[PDB]
């Protein structure tokens, strides 16, 4: 429950330390019960580094020191149904892993393949059909006659139905409308705080403000800084030189400070951007 | 894409339609095999290009490596000096002399040349240009049950998706490792339901996406033949008379002993 | 009027090309051809020349590149679709007239004889290959065909 | 004036007829020249509003409540001549990408219409250049970055020279700062070509940028008015189930945090100049 890289590199085709592309220099140290980010601009390291953590790719210069297990470059295929019961990355539009004829058998596919009978995995396939946001109709049925928010709850329960130590998330409420992505994400504060190392691949700036505790930023194939929301968007040359952006709760102080208001700070959040339009218009 | 390569910047090898007229001539040509102006010629006058591609010598073991019990296995059934089966004409089978060694080694050229002139089909051309030459000779099939303009959509579109598929056919295999998974596990009459997490979402994206691909085709102007102009075309240049003589010189350099 | 039946044979036939390409990372192809799947889903309520222009839309459109998959080099395109020109015009005798006389009696019996002579030589060096085609290629009609393949196969089309 | 009457229209899916109608109501109209958002809970039958308009859908009838324009109607043997009045981008441009270039798919819509290829080289360049796509000239689309297939796809309309652009759930799978690049690529065309772009459910700048807004549940409409008239109804919208733009999601975090400026303030240039009117 303390995930570090020192140091990881992955280029598809051979050679080291050459050259730069893909995932370069990749070094940090995370924490157990935190809300991690994988941010930046598209084309740097998020999807391309997400897939390493749980060994669905293995480095080419160093090591993935992780929750329990450990990924090396020479790694194999032994001891992966506890690893992949400790880490369960969630990819972009994961309502695409769907194949069963009951839902429950997709959410039973997480606990099974990881070691549980049908009738215990009926208590993870039912707990994760109920504690993931679906009603007395949809705590079991056919797995397609649903919507993509309800199938992204099969998608995100079938991958959560073992309670993994770690749950990475490649924008896993992507495509969802106002209310769908504002229920799956607070969900991930109750089951992050369970002691659970929540990572998040995205570019929603106004979600690191909202949901994060620390961050992890990249560019162009080289890690620019492992951070935490306030050491991040102070200098807006780090959003201009380094390709990134800010939240519209943070993007607006400068739209209000640039009138003479000069808000108290760079607050970045919505309930706390507006305590500063107050403590300064006094 | 797709092996092998439009590598930069090799000699002509252009007009992906005239290297189809060529590659099939050079099999519809190297029929009628009797004499020496044919083999020593075709084996080097039909190779004078294939080499001119110059691409490294270790490529053709891709075309020969993992099955060698055809070539000097079944051409040896040709090694009877006279009609290597079911000879049948006339009266001597095996020889090591001026005439049983040629006929039976004379196929180590006339047959292993059309696998080179064909390699250098899938070697020099763009798979979106190997495709347009298949269709060039094609759509003039408007004599018969025509049906020709619906297969020339498919080809831009069959190939529009060989990457979109393999690029997602795959992510379903890595997305089905938050859930599982069982992939390599043998068993003849035991295990084959390894490929289920993947083929079950894959048939959606044949069947569903072809509904949501066909309704934006339809709802632009696709009333669909008749009408229907087109955009994907290429020109010929003064350059591309090279394979048009390649096969004309080899008309006379074919008969010039039969004369 | 009732089209959108072709614009699928661009996208069904992108997935029999991209199924014998194996999704080559973890390669769920073990041993010989595993594309015939959706290709009885086409008998089951689709068409006759739908079955034929899906393999000549493969053993052309994945002949690039390299090409020939089973055997060494350049042949066997729609002598592989004489197996499929007679398809529909059980699971047990779909790989057993196939196994026995249909499948390879056109593929190499063409290739390994042209003057009018013997053919068994290279033809069934592939003996056990052609009886290893059908280990789970019979047992492939059990999992994926009857329920998954041809049920949904209906709900999309016929609109 | 008005460019579409959708009267007391309705859609019913094949088996879900007596269990679950798709509209049954709505009873709306759009303005010939405006940017129209349609918002509502995600079952409200609204992502189909734009398939009734080009004859993809003959859902229930064509006589009792038909669709009409001030030129033509849906749907006769003309229903095809109402794919020349209209033009629609869609959800996932990856699929509706017919042609492994950029210029092939922009000029598949002049293909089908007898329009000469020399005049298609040109209609298609400054349709794929008006979107920045000259330097990504013939890029295959299974390679293309998901952002750019939605700009290859607003060209396809300009190549076919419509009257009406329509957004059918477009830029939802797209990155937060993927959509605001493409959704200004369409307000330019509302300047460069003064057409009428009919939008569907998203939020602030797919909703409160817009000139109108319609909120629908479960298939039925209240509040056809401007986004500013609509979202102030914040509660029988939380039972409709929605959000409001961060325009309005701070004025309430300012009416709760002290700043109680009047409740018609929509511009991002109304939360900037109305809020130094208060430092005094």
Author numbering:
A (entry chain C): 1 to 282
B (entry chain D): 6 to 264
C (entry chain A): 7 to 95, 106 to 175
D (entry chain B): 1 to 280
Tell me, in the authors' exact words, what the paper reports.
ECF-transporters are multi-subunit membrane complexes that consist of two ATPases, similar to the ATPases of ABC transporters, and two membrane embedded proteins, not related to any other protein family. The two ATPases and one of the transmembrane proteins, EcfT, form the ‘energizing unit’ or ’ ECF-module’. The other membrane protein, termed S-component, acts as the substrate-binding protein and dynamically associates with the ECF-module to allow for substrate translocation. We demonstrate that ECF-CbrT is a Cbl transporter that catalyses ATP-dependent uptake of Cbl and its precursor Cbi.
We crystallized the ECF-CbrT complex in detergent (n-Dodecyl-β-D-maltopyranoside, DDM) solution and solved a crystal structure to 3.4 Å resolution using molecular replacement with the structure of the folate transporter, ECF-FolT2, from L. delbrueckii as a search model. There are two copies of ECF-CbrT in the asymmetric unit, corresponding to molecules A and B, each of them comprising CbrT, EcfT, EcfA and EcfA’. CbrT is in a ‘toppled’ orientation in the ECF-CbrT complex with TMs 1, 2, 3 and 4 oriented almost parallel to the membrane plane. Although OH-Cbl was added in excess to the crystallization condition, the substrate was not bound. The apo-state of the toppled S-component was observed before in other ECF-type transporters and likely represents the inward-facing state after substrate release. In contrast to ECF-FolT2, and structurally characterized ECF complexes from other organisms, the binding cavity in ECF-CbrT is largely occluded, and not accessible from the cytosol. The occlusion is caused mainly by the position of loop 3, which obstructs access to the cavity in CbrT. We speculate that occlusion of the empty binding site after cytoplasmic release of the substrate may be required for the subsequent reorientation of the S-component, upon release from the ECF module.
